[PDB]
Amino acid sequence: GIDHTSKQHKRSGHRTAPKSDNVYLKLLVKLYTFLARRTDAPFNKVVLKALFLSKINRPPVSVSRIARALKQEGAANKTVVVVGTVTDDARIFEFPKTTVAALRFTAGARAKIVKAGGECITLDQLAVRAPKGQNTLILRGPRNSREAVRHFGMGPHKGKAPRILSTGRKFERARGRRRSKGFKV
Amino acid sequence: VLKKNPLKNKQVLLRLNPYAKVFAAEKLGSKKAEKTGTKPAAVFTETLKHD
């Protein structure tokens, strides 16, 4: 016998591979597993872990978010890398030049980047240009902006959204939501 | 692949501890202490034997 301080046979609880059966994503993972092992660059370890993430943990990155990032001081000529999809945003007018590396470009995003003189590249083309992540800038989309997150942690006084199909005057605005009808929240 | 005990395997003893060759040669496990002629005080003995 052994007085176990921890739980035995506990899996790490991190993905160690994409759950996806996309062949081409599996090739990207074969590449970045190689570079992460054989270089010392922190970048490659990060990009490798990002290729494992589920769709909800790879939120899209608009081109306005890329544009905002290149306004950072000393950042205008960095390769922006998005381990995921770059979407268009018609809320910006002037987009800078720049090279963006990503898994996917929407048709509109690829148009807007190219029209400004830029270049959209795959993550394997990034590997050859920047094997040690040289001169890159990793961007992540916003995670906590999903509709589902509005509803997490629902409870008295917590200020979260109820799970509700129909909204209006008659749907969950009475006893419990105002002092005049029993009490508020 | 196989833990050898220094305390049995003489080769492994020497690997871990180069002084073991010296220690054995000079027989430091059986060192004679130098004779001294110290005697306890009366008081020490008188209390030792006291009823």
Binding site: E172, R175, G176 | -
Partner: protein, 148 residues
């Protein structure tokens, strides 16, 4: 498909995953929303506050078309010019040949003011406008023409 369900993995385990003690009986707790003010009060108060009781005034025979007024922010707005013609109009910022943007034709009923437009005059036809949307269009040298 049936071959991936846990029904298949419970084959041989007596209770089908429902317990020896408690069991899978018919409707312990009552059917549907039974008991919302009695034995299900805690759930209802925690996750559906506001569920019981009335607020506000009735409206008999409400027709939703009366309330049709879809909103467009200025943020967008230039989206309503087609992408071919957009780039020329932005570089040729002219009080003499400003683009007309019929926001009703596009299927909108009110221009709201979120965000920033280019400093390029535009004629905006709309049913309604916010106060700030109008200020921003005029500050770019535009006008709001009201229509019906």
């Amino acid at each position: 498909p049936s071959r991936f369900t846990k029904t298949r993995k419970h084959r041989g385990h007596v209770s089908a995953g429902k317990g020896r003690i408690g069991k899978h009986r018919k409707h312990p707790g009552g059917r549907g929303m039974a008991g919302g003010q009695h034995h299900h009060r805690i759930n209802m108060d925690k996750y559906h506050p506001g569920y019981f009781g009335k607020v506000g005034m009735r409206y008999f025979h409400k027709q939703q078309a009366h309330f049709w007024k879809p909103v467009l922010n200025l943020d967008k707005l230039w989206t309503l010019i087609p992408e071919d013609k957009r780039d020329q109009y932005l570089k040729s910022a002219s009080k003499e040949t400003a683009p007309v943007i019929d926001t009703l034709a596009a299927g909108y009923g009110k221009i709201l003011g979120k965000g920033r437009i280019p400093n390029v005059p535009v004629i905006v036809k709309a049913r309604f406008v916010s106060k700030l949307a109008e200020e921003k269009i005029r500050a770019a040298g535009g006008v709001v023409e009201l229509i019906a």
